[PDB]
Amino acid sequence: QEFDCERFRADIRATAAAIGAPIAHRLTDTVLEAFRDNFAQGATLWKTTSQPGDQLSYSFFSRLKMDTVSRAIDAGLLDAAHPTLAVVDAWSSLYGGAPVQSGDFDAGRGMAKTWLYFGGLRPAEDILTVPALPASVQARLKDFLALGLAHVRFAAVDWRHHSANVYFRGKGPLDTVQFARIHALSGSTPPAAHVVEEVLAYMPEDYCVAITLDLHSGDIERVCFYALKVPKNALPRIPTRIARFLEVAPSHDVEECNVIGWSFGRSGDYVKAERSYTGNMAEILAGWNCFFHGEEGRDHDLRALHQ
Numbered sequence: 001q002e003f004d005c006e007r008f009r010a011d012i013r014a015t016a017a018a019i020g021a022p023i024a025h026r027l028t029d030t031v032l033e034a035f036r037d038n039f040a041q042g043a044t045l046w047k048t049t050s051q052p053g054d055q056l057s058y059s060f061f062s063r064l065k066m067d068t069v070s071r072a073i074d075a076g077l078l079d080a081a082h083p084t085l086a087v088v089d090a091w092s093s094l095y096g097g098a099p100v101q102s103g104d105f106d107a108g109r110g111m112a113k114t115w116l117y118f119g120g121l122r123p124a125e126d127i128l129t130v131p132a133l134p135a136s137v138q139a140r141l142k143d144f145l146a147l148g149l150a151h152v153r154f155a156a157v158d159w160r161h162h163s164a165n166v167y168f169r170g171k172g173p174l175d176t177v178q179f180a181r182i183h184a185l186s187g188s189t190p191p192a193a194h195v196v197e198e199v200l201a202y203m204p205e206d207y208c209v210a211i212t213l214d215l216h217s218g219d220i221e222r223v224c225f226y227a228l229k230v231p232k233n234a235l236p237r238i239p240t241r242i243a244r245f246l247e248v249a250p251s252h253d254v255e256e257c258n259v260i261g262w263s264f265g266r267s268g269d270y271v272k273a274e275r276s277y278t279g280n281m282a283e284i285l286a287g288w289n290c291f292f293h294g295e296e297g298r299d300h301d302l303r304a305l306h307q
Ligand SMILES: *[C@@](O)(Cc1ccc(O)cc1)C(=O)O
Pocket: 153, 167, 208, 209, 226, 227, 228, 259, 274, 285, 290, 291
């Protein structure tokens, strides 16, 4: 029911083996020792994608507010000279230090991402014109504003790939054309109509889309559309690897929480999935004002900012 650390170690080993993902035993023990409290007090959850052999990820969504980046550096999980540290510092220090850091880790490779919840609907300009970002990335602000992607709720630094994932909420409903315009940012081949129609059927009215930017070129590598807390009997068509993941990864939460993401990019499309483990993922998502599958997905503050 509750978070226990020895059980977590075993569930990491077991789940990685179940989906055919790599394992790094000592590195995983270091993450757990460095961030025990973070996992225990937050929502701890699982992630992977439909790419064959992909990593099993485990994360904490934070209730405890602290400098998780400094902790990761302390523990030898992140290089003290990582060139993206400046950006994560800039983002953490906005709005007088209100943003809260969470963390993603890979069972095979250690620290993967630092994720910031900014504590409201933030102007995209604030996020995208901190001086720590290069000109080439700041220049994409206008592409985003042109598509009406004007408010940001989260941003993640991907330490492994030197890129950033920016999470926007758009005023919808999302239609074929707006899908196409967002998808076109990614450079990848337009998909067939049933792909689009299925994605649209899972979106709330005011939709969540993640855009992945390379922090050195400003290239948009990837876009991802998300459906949160989809019940098992309402799931869209999924890759057998994702179906297996949702079956084998253990969830102890009172309310089960599965997340489905459709990722499109030039290197290949895939499906992302998240699944609750402990510490009440749904209750943290509700706190962030996320919209769940089969609900009212209307954002009134967003709608007042657009009128
Ligand atoms: C988006 O769907 C982003 C998102 C994705 C996964 C989790 O777990 C939380 C949020 C949104 O709701 O803002």
